[PDB]
């Protein structure tokens, strides 16, 4: 009653994009990889249920779902887009998910490859005993 708890977890979202040696048959010029993980190789699976990357409609079966680490999608494409990522938690009370609009951008041929890192600090105010147990790993 007198105490109160805020748990903070760090998440790392990022992506890599490189112009291919040769395009694919449809003219896909880049190979990219997008991911969600924890800093310093920490294990977020303790509290992460699944990660859903929402690709752009032009990909076959755009809803890419990783239920286990590594939480990443490897694709080939030709243009950058905004990529909704949903992170689902091993809990039962709101929030059960968190959403980020991830900007999956590509550089032009002749320009340096992308290696991008985006930080996010999530704060859970007074979670359940079980959920706090897993957040703390």
């Amino acid at each position: 009653m007198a105490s109160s708890c805020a748990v903070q977890v760090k998440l790392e979202l990022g992506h890599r994009a490189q112009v291919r040696k040769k395009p694919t048959v449809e003219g896909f010029t880049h190979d990219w990889m997008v991911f969600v993980r924890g800093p310093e190789h920490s294990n977020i699976q303790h509290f992460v249920e699944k990660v859903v990357f929402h690709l752009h409609e032009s990909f076959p079966r755009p809803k890419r779902v990783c239920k286990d680490p590594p939480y990443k999608v490897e694709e080939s494409g030709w243009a950058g887009f905004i990529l909704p990522i949903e992170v689902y938690f091993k809990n039962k009370e709101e929030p059960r998910k968190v959403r980020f609009d991830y900007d999956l951008f590509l550089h032009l041929e002749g320009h340096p490859p992308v290696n991008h890192l985006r930080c996010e600090k999530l704060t859970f105010n007074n979670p359940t005993e079980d959920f706090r147990r897993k957040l703390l790993k």
């Binding site: 010029t29 880049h30 752009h56 032009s58 030709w78 243009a79 950058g80 887009f81 951008f105 590509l106 550089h107 032009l108 320009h111």
Partner: peptide, 6 residues
Amino acid sequence: QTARKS
């Protein structure tokens, strides 16, 4: 950066 699609 390259083109973007919507």
